[PDB]
């Protein structure tokens, strides 16, 4: 008859318990200590300006109404019980669509200590908003947040605090990173207050700092475009009497350049403003176009001013590579110092 | 035992949540508010836009007034199913959802005199038919309508509060191609098979940003048409050179023409972008056909073809410049 004690303890625990009222309704401002363990920093979708994150959200607080005395010090409770006591109604301010996992059973735990302290852990995937400034794409670093707090309880009723020093209260698993196009440099945590028409509310924020990887864009956009420009310029070392060769060469180079530009922009999401990749694309495309038109001028001035035709061929030969080299130096320096 | 517990237990005693306050006396008057967290992406393909709001409603329920020393009850989402709640719905929403993590995101506050405040967080995929003429130089202002589902004008009347609909930053919003310009709110009565209903509207003025489209479509197309112009300045005996140049410009133009409309629904009218791209393609076509005709006539009327070469040199750039001028002035005017 050693289980009757626990069943009676649990049955009495809720006797005369009102879960519409926060703990410490007439004594305190309820104080919830929060901790987040990021099991995996999910993928970041720059198309949707969002990122996914899977966390073990641990919230603790005190409930004098649930003090108990018995053989056990810490008491395990089930979802049917946790649904009958008051729990903080935390929500994610920038959350889009979060799922609480319930297979094979709800992924929640509720522990009570003899002194009335509760620990409520929940495993849940959060899809949160990641407002992205893609001006320096593909060299852009983002710091987009995870902000949570209470709905319906102002700072005069419920206040959140980090259970440990703030920097150590958000912990990312070593193998958590599920990112393939970004790199997680670290995070910063903070607290704050948000003013609404219904009062002031406590906000707990965490910024995860990301840095985009460049190797893919280099090896699949930048090098093909640079080499197409190089070809367009290679046109100049041929002879002027090879008119069909020069014309087909230039026109097919422009065709390849349009193909590359279409592919690159189709890769990037549809943002209506200019990114570093767009600047590179446009400048290289301008170089190809200018080489073709310069050849046209050389061909025109042939048969009528051969001296000037040769002079301009030599001048273009000398100048265009210098302009392209200077542009590359300036562009890469200005976008890598940042 | 506790004071507030007794107040709540007394309030809920003898309460029928199936009957609106004043079910047979006068219409329930509900004041409404909105705090727009964000306006998500506007996809013209499906003719919808996402919006995230905090939606608040206030009304008087004479059965919810108490006489304690406490002035206001501050509550969770636990009592929302216990008291009567208006059945407000969004008339033009393809799909909407409330938020449930970690706890239902509702709020309830009952005042001493029976006044009730109810707030919930919503995400709405509102529908609006975008007149896609002048695209990409198009402006839109499309609504969010809501009303009661079952209570006609004689039971429920909605009314906007002084400063009801408010927007937040507008800097972090996910409006890719558009730019929030302003909002307006309206009231109307709409007749239905069920009855007359007070319909409340909020309008959001969205202006497209050329940006993406202008760069990708307009500049490459213009330079491709200029390629045929430069072709004009080569020679008459350079037959393979001119023919290859014209055909490859045609191929490049055809490649370009497809991605212009990949950001558009399958609308069966002509947009500004489509007109521009088609005109450019016709310009390239006409340049190559002109060279073909000149090469044919080189054996018939050399004296006439000599005039024709320079005549084309003159006309083609001038015609394209006039087309640009008229096109841009007319569309930017609209």
């Amino acid at each position, epitope marked *: 008859d050693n289980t009757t004690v626990f069943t009676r303890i649990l049955d009495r625990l809720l006797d005369g318990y009102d879960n519409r009222l926060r703990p*410490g*309704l*007439g*004594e*305190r*401002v309820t104080e919830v200590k929060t901790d987040i363990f990021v099991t995996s920093f999910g993928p970041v979708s720059d198309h949707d300006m969002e990122y996914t994150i899977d966390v073990f959200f641990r919230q603790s607080w005190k409930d*004098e109404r649930l003090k108990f005395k018995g053989p056990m010090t810490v008491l395990r409770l089930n979802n049917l019980m946790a649904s009958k006591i008051w729990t903080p109604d935390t929500f994610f301010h920038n959350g889009k669509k979060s799922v609480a996992h319930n297979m094979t059973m709800p992924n929640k735990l509720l522990r009570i200590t003899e002194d009335g302290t509760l620990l409520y852990t929940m495993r849940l995937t959060v899809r949160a908003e990641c407002p992205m400034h893609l001006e320096d794409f593909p060299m852009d670093a983002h710091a987009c947040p995870l902000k949570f707090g209470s709905y319906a309880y*102002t*700072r*005069a*009723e419920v*206040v959140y605090e980090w259970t440990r020093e703030p920097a150590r209260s958000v912990v990312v698993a070593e193998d958590g990173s599920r990112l393939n196009q970004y790199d997680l440099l670290g995070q910063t945590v903070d607290s704050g*207050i948000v*003013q609404s028409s219904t*009062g*002031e509310y406590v906000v707990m924020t965490t910024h995860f700092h990301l840095k985009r990887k460049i190797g893919y864009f280099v090896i699949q956009t930048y090098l093909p475009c640079i080499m197409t420009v190089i070809l367009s310029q290679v046109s100049f070392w041929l002879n002027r009497e090879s008119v069909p060769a020069r014309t087909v060469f230039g026109v097919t180079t422009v065709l390849t350049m349009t193909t590359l530009s279409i592919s690159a922009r189709n890769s990037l999401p549809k943002v209506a403003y200019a990114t570093a990749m767009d600047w590179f694309i446009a400048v290289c495309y301008a170089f190809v176009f200018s080489a073709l038109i310069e050849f046209a001028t050389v061909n025109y001035f042939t048969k009528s001013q051969p001296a000037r035709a040769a002079k301009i061929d030599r001048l273009s030969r000398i100048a265009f590579p210098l302009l392209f080299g200077i542009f590359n130096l300036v562009y890469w320096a200005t976008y890598l110092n940042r | 035992e506790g*004071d*507030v517990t007794v107040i709540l237990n007394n309030l809920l005693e003898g309460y029928d949540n199936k009957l609106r306050p004043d079910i047979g006396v006068k219409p329930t008057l509900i004041h409404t508010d909105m705090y727009v967290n964000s306006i998500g992406p506007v996809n013209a393909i499906n003719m919808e836009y996402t919006i995230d709001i905090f939606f608040a409603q206030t009304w008087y329920d004479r059965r919810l007034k108490f006489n304690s*020393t*406490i*002035k*206001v*009850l*501050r509550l969770n989402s636990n009592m929302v199913g216990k008291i009567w709640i208006p059945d407000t719905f969004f008339r033009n929403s393809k799909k909407a959802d409330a938020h449930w993590i970690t706890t239902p995101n509702r709020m309830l506050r009952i005042w001493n005199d029976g006044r009730v405040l109810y707030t919930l967080r919503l995400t709405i995929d509102a529908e609006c038919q975008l007149q896609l003429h002048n695209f990409p130089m198009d402006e839109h202002s499309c609504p969010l309508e809501f009303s009661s589902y079952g209570y006609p004008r004689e039971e429920i009347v909605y009314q906007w509060k002084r400063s009801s609909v408010e927007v937040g930053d507008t800097r972090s919003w996910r409006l890719y191609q558009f730019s929030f310009v302003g909002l307006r709110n309206t009231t109307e009565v709409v007749k239905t098979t069920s009855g007359d209903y007070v319909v409340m509207s909020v309008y959001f003025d969205l202006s497209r940003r050329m940006g993406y489209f202008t760069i990708q479509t307009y500049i490459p197309c213009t330079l491709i048409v200029v390629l045929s112009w430069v072709s004009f300045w080569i020679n008459k005996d350079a037959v393979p050179a001119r023919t290859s140049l014209g055909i490859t410009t045609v191929l490049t133009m055809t490649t370009l023409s497809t991605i212009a409309r990949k950001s558009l629904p399958k609308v069966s009218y002509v947009t500004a972008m489509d007109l521009f791209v088609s005109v450019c393609f016709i310009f390239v076509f006409s340049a190559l056909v002109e060279y073909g005709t000149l090469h044919y006539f080189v054996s018939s009327q050399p004296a006439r073809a000599a005039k024709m070469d320079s005549y084309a040199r003159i006309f083609f750039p001038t015609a394209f410049c006039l087309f640009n001028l008229v096109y841009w002035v007319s569309y930017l005017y609209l």
Partner: T-cell receptor
Amino acid sequence: EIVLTQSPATLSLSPGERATLSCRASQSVSSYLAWYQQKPGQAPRLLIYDASNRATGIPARFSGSGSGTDFTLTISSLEPEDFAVYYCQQRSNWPPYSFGQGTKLEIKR
Amino acid sequence: EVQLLESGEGLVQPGGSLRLSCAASGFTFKTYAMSWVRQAPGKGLEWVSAISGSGASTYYADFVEGRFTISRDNSKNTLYLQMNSLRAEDTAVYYCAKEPPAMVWFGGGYFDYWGQ
């Protein structure tokens, strides 16, 4: 922490005029600001609570407004007995309760 | 009808002790949070300590480093303040003030009534 500052430190006015007392807080105290009147030789009396609501039995000439960090108390048609010291009190987290230094409202002759 | 009556007046030598009591009548004593406010001679009002309406929770100002202790008895309808390790800076008129009940903080933020 929260520090309430009342300006002016004194306010010299004559009966029948319109007075304005300002209490400015270092950080936001939301709507939790109250105004008290202490006629010398007596205990304080509540005038305005929650920054806008008049207490029970207060003549309608006492009005208050504000929110956040800037609050104001306005007396219209100063009666002779409305000359006293006025305090602003705030309810917050870091200091539970706190009073302003007080504003002494005297007669102008 | 409401009546708060402070008592315990008396001289004290520095480092001494004193027990102020405030007898309340005319209202339900166990529903209101009560507080102690002191005014030094020629100075402004200053809040000393507050006790919940059930006596469970107590709050003290910064200047009282664990020296005072507030208490109440709902059976006697009385509010107490035991003072210890006093100082000459502690001279003042001490008021008991009652705070209305509310679901925010541990009562409305203000004092609805004051003692003499």
